[PDB]
């Protein structure tokens, strides 16, 4: 049924692992085929597995991206959760890091219905040699 | 006008300080007089400054409660932002720490229009004696 609070922590953490290894196939599978992503939040949503698969295609492709949690998945009892992680990637030629908080609502099947990634330039940090 | 990504970080960080010292008056003032709180997210919203002030009245009163950021406020360009923080208080007689993430939308006046505190028992750590 609707993911318990503990199941949300497990799903949202596994998602980070799939993003980490750039497993787009697996990432997309975690999404409902009509899910909506807003990354960055503030930007128009993208709906559907196809468009979403293209989003991660271009985002995890092209360059080197690692991601991992930096704190506990805060999970609720209505199939939702927010998590702190850090994205490592090459920005403006430089190896940079991006602090992000993802909020995720799942459905009665465990799949992500709604994805919202909170970040902007104030969360971007370029790293010295 | 609508708070900038940087204004958001400052606003949301000030909030935590207000909660921390339990300044209910100043906390309520950060709220639009028709703001809606959802703490814990999943629970029915509470509308209006009067119901919100009551919520913090009982939430911050009666017991001891500290709260401080445990990471950077992730802030977007639409007056929104999410923050990671920790809540210290007495739960079930025992001193406990609670991991929470607040999502907040601000209006064109810099006041909180929507509050959403993601957390549950899975984020509750009772401090061993
Ligand atoms: C998209 C991105 C790579 C991966 C990524 C970013 C931001 C938020 C994310 C949120 C996710 O849940 C998964 C991946 C990202 C980076 C911002 C700029 C960029 O290169
Ligand atoms: C409500 C509470 C005190 C304050 C508080 C809690 C949880 C989340 C919060 C989120 C906030 O943005 C502000 C205050 C709280 C505690 C959970 C149990 C408790 O008594």
Radius of gyration of chain A: 14 Å
Specify the CATH architecture of chain A: Roll
Query: Strand-residue fraction of chain A?
Result: 35-45%
**Tally of strands of chain A:** 8
Shape of chain A: globular
Number of domains of chain A: 1
Bound molecules: equilenin
- How far is the first residue's CA from the last residue's CA of chain A? 48 Å
User: Oligomeric form of this entry?
Assistant: homodimer
Characterize the largest beta sheet of chain A: strand count, sense, and whether it forms a barrel: 8 strands, mixed
Short description:
The structure is a homodimer of 129-residue chains. With 129 residues, chain A is of the alpha+beta class. Chain A has a single domain (1-129), classed as Nuclear Transport Factor 2, Chain: A (Roll).
Q: What do these coordinates show?
A:
The structure is a homodimer of 129-residue chains. Chain A has 129 residues and is α+β, with helices and mostly antiparallel strands. Helices cover 26% and strands 40% of the residues of chain A. In chain A, strands 1, 2, 3, 4, 5, 6, 7 and 8 form an eight-stranded mixed beta sheet that branches. The N and C termini of chain A lie far apart (48 Å).
């Amino acid at each position: 049924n609707l993911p318990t609070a503990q199941e949300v922590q497990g799903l949202m953490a596994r998602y980070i692992e799939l993003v980490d290894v750039g497993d787009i196939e697996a990432i997309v599978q975690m999404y409902a085929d009509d899910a909506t992503v807003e990354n960055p939040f503030g930007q128009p949503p993208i709906h559907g597995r196809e468009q979403i698969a293209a989003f991660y295609r271009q985002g995890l492709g092209g360059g080197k991206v690692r991601a991992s949690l930096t704190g506990p998945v805060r999970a609720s009892h209505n199939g939702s959760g927010a998590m702190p992680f850090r994205v490592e990637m090459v920005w403006n030629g430089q190896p940079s890091a991006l602090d992000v908080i993802d909020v995720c609502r799942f459905d009665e099947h465990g799949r992500i219905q709604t994805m919202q990634a909170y970040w902007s330039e104030v969360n971007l940090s370029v790293r010295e040699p």
